[PDB]
């Protein structure tokens, strides 16, 4: 086994190489959301509760998501509009079963165009959403989809939730940089079939799921050792890390029951994310010296506009570095874990069609963080690319 | 940079250092299942079906299975006996919550105290179980329990199923070799709390899964560059592989739904498994210039006794073969993941015991096969450690 070890290995670092995104052919506003959500589900006369979603709309700084669900689906699904009166588990499973992997695909589709390489070179496939049906679990069919060769390597990421852009990259980093030659299909496939429902007084938390969940599925390849003038890298994974914050098991959550996935959201994760973040910054860049954060290109979960809004001031960030950021919370919303790679995606080409010196805003080191359940906070150094 | 990415990584193989495993308390025998099954379902007076039944038990080569279900809380769950006619989701998800993390510390103690170390040095956990009853998934209840760093990277494997067992070692060789220091923890905890319903003629297909599954944790310490006098290594993960069988989706599937997990098996299985294990070992050793099946130890997931015959038949394998391999399904039945894990213990322990050179049988090489939906079959080469 002399030399076995080296050779199996790759030598670089593991880089982003194409990067590609899909929604549902639905764009829904924001703007006019509330009546048509309490309209469809039965509950136009609950002016109350119409007025506390509409001023959670109104704050979200969200102008449209897109959206799988549409008035005639929700027609020909009532249970779906329910609460919890009713089940809903098994109808969801069967929208879940066609939309998640169909947008996977569309998204990898894009990536693999991108790439610029046939799918046959493609080695291993990281694939996550919230949930998934059955079991193969939609890695499979995913894969069946995009007529992947057999052998390719799959793990599927489940029930991770938001935090899970951040996940897929870290686990990314290790397969591309142990394995010489190989080629990481990453995908992150989110839809709401799994998580609308009808308003409750009783569960304003589940109400502020419902004004910012969208859907969207992103799709990179991740690989060391690109090829000289054939693949072109946007970003290299230099670090990462994955940590709980203490004590705050409630604060983000949810449930697979026989009414589908519930969730469950409290009021004081903005606080806790951001007492939190400094030390997960130390902590990623002290080893690089850097301690002026401003000196770094950002991509933060788009969780909710507080908790950018509350990251942005406990750390001083200056107004530009959550643009992109909030680019993609107001034309999206938030996709969970698809999150981060739209904004990836949309900070490149900013910085090429804004003539920048790199793929990150003309800056060298970058930060990527996902939150979730946990709470866990995902963080991912990058590097960016010359231009 | 390129300093430190050589730093980052590590230097050897992937080796287990350690191995623990648990089962619930409740020994159930074979012997007796059938007029226990079928009563404590209400279905004694279905005759033909508990004479089908009685034939799978008595040719199923298994003596035994450990169930967190017993006749008592059977009793206070009349929905878990039932087929379908009533959902019963809710009511698993809440023992799953329960057992399957307390299946899990239980083996990760064990797994642990062998080990030797403290668990402040562990960096990664690879959770799996078929399924996961919330979010966050049993990655962090486990973590939690064990009281783990709150930065012990997590990584959860759910609704992959029986041949996971394979998938987390071909994983945590990536998350070992290419991160120096990283001592990674994988877990693989499974119950029938989720698959256990009452006998239907009109799904066949369903009935087998009764006789054969059983529940049972395992836990190791997945590390490379073990230090010297003070960690000790039983197996290296050299190399690893996994494919899909042509046309055989439907051969073992299983679906989320509100009557709880349903899954099915073919009769087919056996055959595809055989058919395309050959292929499996070519692809997997020539690289090793090894040819003769016979001059490796073996570990193969003990889905039932007719893939463990083929598959010996097929490979024309010597009678002590598959010894290890028919006494981990005969005291425990079909743990899903776990099995292959148990096996390796089995495997080593009898190596040590009697007196052999290596603790895989006196050979050098060896060979582990998980199976499950897909029908995916995972490959992974282990090298023994000198005794
Ligand atoms: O032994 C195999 O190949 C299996 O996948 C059997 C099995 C055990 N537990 C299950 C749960 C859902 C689907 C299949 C199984």
Same mark, same amino acid.
């Given at each position: 086994?002399? !030399?076995?070890?080296?050779?199996?290995?790759?030598?670089?670092?593991?880089?982003?190489?194409?990067? !590609?995104?899909?929604?549902?052919?639905?764009?829904?506003?924001?703007? %006019?959301?509330?009546?048509?959500?309490?309209?469809?589900?039965?509950?136009?006369?609950?002016?109350?509760?119409?007025?506390?979603?509409?001023?959670?709309?109104?704050?979200?700084?969200?102008?449209?998501?897109?959206?799988?669900?549409?008035?005639?689906?929700?027609?020909?699904?009532?249970?779906?509009?329910?609460?919890?009166?009713?089940?809903?588990?098994?109808?969801?499973?069967?929208?879940? #079963?066609?939309?998640?992997?169909?947008?996977?695909?569309?998204?990898?589709?894009?990536?693999?165009?991108?790439?610029?390489?046939?799918?046959?070179?493609?080695?291993?496939?990281?694939?996550?959403?919230?949930?998934?049906?059955?079991?193969?679990?939609?890695?499979?069919?995913?894969?069946?989809?995009?007529?992947?060769?057999? $052998?390719?390597?799959?793990?599927?990421?489940?029930?991770?939730?938001?935090?899970?852009?951040?996940? +897929?990259?870290?686990? #990314?980093?290790?397969?591309?940089?142990?394995?010489?030659?190989?080629?990481?299909?990453?995908?992150?496939?989110?839809?709401?079939?799994?998580?609308?429902?009808?308003?409750?007084? %009783?569960?304003?938390?589940?109400?502020?799921?419902?004004?910012?969940?969208?859907?969207?599925?992103?799709?990179?390849?991740?690989?060391?050792?690109?090829?000289?003038?054939?693949?072109? #890298?946007?970003?290299?994974? +230099?670090?990462?890390?994955?940590?709980?914050?203490?004590?705050?098991? !409630?604060?983000?959550?949810?449930?697979?029951?026989?009414?589908?996935?519930?969730?469950?959201?409290?009021?004081?994760?903005?606080?806790?994310?951001?007492?939190?973040?400094?030390?997960?910054?130390?902590?990623?860049?002290?080893?690089?010296?850097?301690?002026?954060?401003?000196?770094?290109?950002?991509?933060?979960?788009?969780?909710?506009?507080?908790?950018?809004?509350? +990251?942005?001031?406990?750390?001083?960030?200056?107004?530009?570095?959550?643009?992109?950021?909030?680019? +993609?919370?107001?034309?999206?919303?938030?996709?969970? $874990?698809?999150?981060?790679?739209?904004?990836?995606?949309?900070?490149?080409? #900013?910085?090429?069609?804004?003539?920048? $010196?790199?793929? !990150?805003?003309?800056?060298?080191?970058?930060?990527?963080?996902?939150?979730?359940?946990?709470?866990?906070?995902?963080?991912?150094?990058?590097?960016?690319?010359?231009?």
């Amino acid at each position: 086994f002399e !030399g076995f070890r080296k050779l199996q290995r790759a030598d670089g670092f593991a880089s982003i190489l194409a990067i !590609g995104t899909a929604n549902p052919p639905n764009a829904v506003d924001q703007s %006019t959301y509330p009546d048509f959500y309490f309209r469809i589900t039965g509950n136009e006369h609950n002016t109350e509760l119409k007025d506390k979603f509409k001023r959670i709309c109104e704050r979200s700084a969200i102008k449209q998501r897109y959206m799988y669900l549409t008035e005639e689906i929700l027609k020909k699904n009532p249970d779906v509009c329910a609460f919890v009166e009713v089940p809903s588990l098994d109808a969801r499973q069967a929208m879940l #079963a066609m939309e998640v992997p169909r947008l996977a695909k569309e998204a990898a589709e894009k990536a693999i165009q991108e790439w610029g390489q046939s799918k046959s070179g493609i080695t291993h496939l990281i694939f996550c959403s919230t949930t998934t049906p059955d079991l193969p679990g939609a890695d499979f069919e995913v894969a069946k989809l995009l007529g992947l060769h057999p $052998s390719v390597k799959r793990v599927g990421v489940f029930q991770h939730g938001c935090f899970a852009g951040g996940t +897929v990259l870290r686990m #990314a980093k290790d397969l591309a940089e142990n394995n010489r030659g190989a080629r990481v299909l990453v995908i992150c496939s989110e839809t709401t079939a799994v998580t609308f429902r009808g308003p409750s007084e %009783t569960h304003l938390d589940s109400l502020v799921g419902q004004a910012l969940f969208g859907d969207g599925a992103s799709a990179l390849i991740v690989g060391a050792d690109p090829i000289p003038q054939v693949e072109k #890298a946007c970003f290299e994974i +230099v670090w990462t890390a994955q940590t709980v914050v203490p004590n705050s098991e !409630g604060a983000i959550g949810g449930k697979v029951r026989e009414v589908g996935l519930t969730f469950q959201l409290k009021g004081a994760v903005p606080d806790l994310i951001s007492a939190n973040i400094e030390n997960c910054m130390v902590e990623a860049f002290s080893q690089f010296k850097i301690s002026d954060w401003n000196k770094l290109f950002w991509v933060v979960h788009p969780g909710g506009r507080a908790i950018l809004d509350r +990251v942005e001031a406990k750390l001083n960030l200056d107004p530009t570095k959550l643009i992109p950021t909030r680019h +993609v919370m107001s034309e999206y919303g938030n996709m969970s $874990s698809a999150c981060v790679h739209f904004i990836l995606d949309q900070t490149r080409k #900013a910085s090429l069609q804004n003539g920048c $010196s790199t793929t !990150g805003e003309g800056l060298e080191m970058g930060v990527l963080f996902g939150f979730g359940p946990g709470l866990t906070i995902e963080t991912v150094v990058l590097k960016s690319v010359p231009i």
